[PDB]
A paper describes a structure:
Branched chain TAms (BCATs) catalyse reversible transamination of branched chain amino acids.
The AF0933 structure has been determined in the holoform (AF0933_holo) and in complex with the inhibitor gabaculine (GABC) (AF0933_GABC) to 2.1 and 2.0 Å resolution, respectively, in the orthorhombic P212121 space group. The interdomain loop could only be fully built in one subunit (D) out of the six subunits in both the AF0933_holo and AF0933_GABC structures. The crystal contacts in AF0933 appear to be contributing to the lower disorder of the loop in the D subunit. The residues Gln107 and Asn108 were modeled with alternative conformations of the main chain in most subunits of the AF0933_holo structure and in the subunits E and F of the AF0933_GABC structure. Residue Glu249 is a Ramachandran plot outlier in all subunits of both AF0933 structures. In the AF0933 BCAT enzyme this loop is poorly ordered and moves away from the active site. However, the AF0933 enzyme had a native molecular mass of approximately 220 kDa as determined by size exclusion chromatography, indicating that it forms a homo-hexamer with only small amounts of a homo-dimeric enzyme observed.
Residue numbers in the entry:
A (entry chain B), F (entry chain C): 1 to 119, 124 to 290
B (entry chain A), C (entry chain F), D (entry chain E): 1 to 119, 123 to 290
E (entry chain D): 1 to 290
């Protein structure tokens, strides 16, 4: 029933498989994106594709097709599955080499496009915990690369699962707030909004869209380092990402954030963001 | 011609494939080992299997079979391919789940065993190494003690080495101490004494452990302690250790000749002793 | 019904009060100890008093009496309350001064001795622990070796543990190494060997020292070395040590079962040996 | 003569005492503020009270009264002592609980308000400062943004300054950036522009905020950014800000004259503007 | 043929020598500047002299003459050698003292001015662009040996240069003690991405006079500009990268750690800034002769 | 009339000058040693020469003569000046090159040997202060290299001069005790001695000799990281170096160390070290 684009063919999900000798599998040597289709439009497709190519560049991986070709493949995959509302996961792998680490011995990067249909926690808000693991360092495994190396994020998620949080919050190698395991973080205090610079986290496309809205609404905004203290004493906290959209965080490390309910500024941004997703995007069908 | 063990079946290499929905593929959420078979014996099989289970425990992954069963699967795979001299790569993945990162939605970890025939031009001359700008994954972020499918830190270091004229990359850690090579542990020889970093910022190498046993047996003064760039540059000899590499001499670091620029006497002695050990020890595949 | 020593007078608990202008209250500017009396003997009294004076020296606080006098005051306080089995908390404060933080304006340090009767369930099952996001106070900022009235770092860790389903919090330090629990030192048991962090990033525990003496006496291989999250997660056994806790097994860390998830054999052996030590050693309270 | 508010009653200073079993005393588990009354007005009372509640929130302490009630208690205490010019120190403690550090066993937080009369030589000449070896408490360990009873880090810095010939201590943070003085925020003036550290590694000073408002009103170029030792040493002018200090010029740092070694023109201008602000703003105590 | 100013006298290059007991030699205890003369004008002379005095202040060294006197000595040295296009290296040392490191035993700081003829034999020498590598050594810390001080302690820079020589780069790029991009071994670094320019704050590197001039041009041209921390990722994924310094002017970086930067050629924004900077150096400066 | 060896000639001190174009002067690009002659013997000459060559190797500088030749030049210089009790400062520079920092343009390293005669604070002990500047990092400008880059040490000394200490004590980039501005540090507590590992400081020749004495006397000894706390609460503290020998530290940051007088263990080591210097060394004359 659902087809996956895999190296020039459409393949049913149950048969969508990659060689175990692909370095993307052996070493997580590959890059991916997360993209949303709303009402027959692909939201910020070009921005996501730009980031995919940036991720590839960072790991010295040449994507064997052009950005225009990649965009067409994504639209084609959504068409083949007749989707209007979907989550899209393009993946590019290093390809097959030998059992060592050398990426120069790898031939034929795989191009994969997964599309899955998209059909309670946002009325109540999420509980978050700060994890003991620091975010992968920007001088070790830069988190700005959306790569198949996501075990740092998974360890944080495992901590959150064990420790009663819906979401994990990372600090970075220098003690600053970084992001959630799968999303950027914003703090609201006295009508002003702050978010960490992007060096220690990922340059979120949702984060960028939300900042555009914040500026359009004239809410005072600063991109600056934040600490545990700012999280705990915030009027409101929310996280942003493709899958999450804008998710309110109402408890952090057992402490109620403000009144413990999604805040007024968060709710306003949720509305404005919904509007943006309904009116922007590359059309799938004509 | 070569078969891979994949979840209870032997599958030809060309067909050995994993679902793209396995979290091992999507997120590198899985663990692996590198094991060597020499002359029909599997060198330190039990030690590698112990480490595999430790790696799995560190990432909260339950391996669905026992260690004894895992050892039997490895031996069976070597038998099916009629190998006596091989490299073995067991892999355990988190398994198929949804497209989020939550490992709770994953069911059925995959168990994979790759065996490839493994039959020293760079070892007579020694290797050139470069120190990389990327630090090793932190022991408080993505602990390098876990041999996981997250190897992009190692690959970035290797990319730097390829671009910068080194056969091998050397990492420093988040605190500025020498960690290891991109795929092996590092030892420094100075005035007849040997030092190696503690294992917290690198990986508890099985070769490293075997080499330390030899060092102690030979009565060479040995210390496990932090090392710096200075110690690398001014060493009498440097070598790296791992399953694939065995003992590889490093004769140039960052453009500087190490000692006389040839593999050193202590390194050569350890290479001989290690060869001897691989020829006389191990779990028999056939016998 | 209990008397507290307070600056030369014995005072009922309900009246044991300190001026709000004491810098020990305003700024946590003071030091303390935790000492145990077992069966009419005070366990390691001299070691605790030495550490109290070391803590005071570290914060440039002169304790206005001698160590011998301090020991006599402690024994007297236990006598006055007729205790044989107790927890003792000596406290020395900077003393009353002005509203600024300058300790030079403080005159007369207060000397306080609290003694409370000691009359487990969590020790048969073992404790659950979580690693906290807050790092331990740095050894170059507010050295954790000082047992001072500044315990908010420990309290924040405890608050995290309370919210996150742990009985105990485990700290990492400013450099990413394992430090200690919020109120106790940490030991890791792996393949019959024991490791514990060096004391620089934590506190030189008197229980920790006693336990190391036992470990050496029993010939269990022991190393004082840096430990990481990986070592915690993959340990055969983990336990914590302190005056109040004695030896407490840790059986779950961050949702991961430690070994079999029950107090381990080595831990149980050390618990027995430590019990024996407390029953046979100490400064007698009554003659 | 002077009364202290303590849990619903006015108590003479000499009798203002807290139980030694209060966690605010045992562990510095509590929060405080420093507020100034000028000419019958309380300067920035609401801002200080907001920060007090933020400090409490950061340490998960529930202040048992509302902010309005707290403001009334402060004004009442100033009235009872007939003060027009005073320093006010509200304190909230975790309260009496057990001898362990667990804050869940604490039940009734104490509310304390100290008011002391206020009544220049060092401000005409300026202060000498030294940079200390101790780093500021980390924003990921014991966040300095919390104005808590844990002030030993500040006291250690002050002890260093006392011993090393400075009127004031300057901290760097865990990452090597300038943080603040032991009891005040720091500003640097260079080529007519002013810089101050972001507030993450120090405290969000109410004086600092007021001074930034003045700076902006006067159109002096201003940047909140990280500063280093170099910026201190080569500054045209340096000054510190806090409730007690107001604006204090720093004219020597680590033996080096700052600019001409006298309070600078920009500093003097800000001192005048700040004086004006304190004379015309505030919550009236009486009228 | 070339004279060096040395403590009040002009001395031929071959005889320009300092006592081995000068702490400037023994311990690198001294400060220096790098200044350019273009077409009879000294570019940003006053800015360089201000930085020289700031460097001296940072190491608690009192320069025994005034800034005006120092400027006159520099112009005099250029005059004596009849230069119009030159590189100028003023140096101030702590002076002769005993063999311990205590600077209190030093008396009489030396003042040295070197001037060497400089200038392009070929206009487009940066037509292809430079290759760079990121080094393993971190930049001297701003809490250890602050890189803002242009001192005679340049071994950190030399180690990075040694790494670059061995590793196939024309230039070395440093990260700092906290993992952020700092600068090249002898120049400030700028990154261009989607028409916007970023550069590290100056705390972990040096407040470059070229960097300041380039920022003025960037602002005048209305290119979006931000001073903020940058990482390896930003270098690798940049549209363009360039470095700035007195000797280098504006040098395009077209390869970093084996990765082509954008199209692997000097970029449009870089080329535009190179032109604008050339114009600035042709029309500004303290006249040597006039 | 003291002579300095300079590239093959003995030159009077007042004329001992180096070209300002030598990179050793321009960039501190060179290495040095500090060696002591006692009663006609050069103490640990071979150890110092080994370290000099190690320093040179660390900065990729080829010393143009052999170690045996270097030792002869040192002895010759002491002979020419008729010294029996002296401080020797051999220096090797990168040499003259262009005005850039590239060491490849530098072709002829200078060899310099300074010898100066050596002829109250030890009875009373020294005051020390801990400095704000951290020691040059072992991953930036490794302090194990005894190079002409000594401004880190000088900044610490400037702090000590201004702050009332005879000596400055450094912490390292990771917060551990490193060393004094010109000497290694040892801490004595409950009859046991500790000293930092050598990675963050310099492998002192005096430090090595003192450790040999400590072992010979059977004093418990451990090489391990030390903190501010260990300094402040020590029974005794002392520093070691060629010029200082063994110097007691009796006050640190305003705190009396033990009783505020040189300790028993320190005094014992001072005696044992004196004995060692009187009975060991390469003879200058026959
Ligand atoms: Cl990392
Ligand atoms: Cl801290
Ligand atoms: Cl450094």
């Amino acid at each position: 029933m659902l087809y996956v684009y895999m190296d020039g063919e459409f393949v049913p999900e149950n048969e969508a498989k990659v060689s175990i000798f692909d370095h993307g599998f052996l070493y997580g040597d590959g890059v991916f994106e997360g993209i949303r289709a709303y009402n027959g439009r692909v939201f910020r497709l070009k921005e996501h594709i730009d980031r995919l190519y940036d991720s590839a560049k960072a790991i010295d991986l040449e994507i064997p097709i052009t950005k225009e070709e990649f965009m067409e493949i994504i639209l084609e995959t959504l068409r083949k599955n007749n989707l209007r509302d979907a989550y899209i996961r393009p993946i590019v792998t290093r390809g097959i080499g030998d059992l060592g680490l050398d990426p120069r011995k790898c031939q034929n990067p795989s191009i994969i496009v997964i599309t899955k249909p998209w059909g309670d926690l946002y009325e109540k808000g999420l509980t978050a915990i700060t994890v003991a693991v620091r975010r992968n360092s920007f001088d070790a495994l830069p988190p700005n690369i959306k790569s198949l190396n996501y075990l740092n994020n998974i360890l944080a998620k495992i901590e959150a699962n064990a420790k009663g949080g819906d979401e994990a919050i990372f600090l970075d190698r220098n003690g600053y707030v970084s992001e959630g395991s799968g999303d950027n973080i914003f703090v609201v205090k006295n009508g002003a909004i702050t978010t960490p610079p992007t060096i220690n986290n990922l340059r979120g496309i949702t984060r960028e869209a939300v900042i555009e809205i914040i500026n359009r609404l004239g809410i005072p905004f600063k991109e600056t380092n934040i600490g545990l203290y700012d999280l705990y004493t915030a009027d409101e906290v929310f996280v942003t990402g493709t899958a999450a959209e804008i998710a309110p965080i109402v408890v952090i490390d057992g402490r109620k954030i403000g009144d413990g309910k999604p805040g007024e500024i968060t709710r306003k941004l949720m509305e404005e963001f919904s509007k943006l997703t309904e009116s922007e995007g590359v059309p799938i069908y004509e």
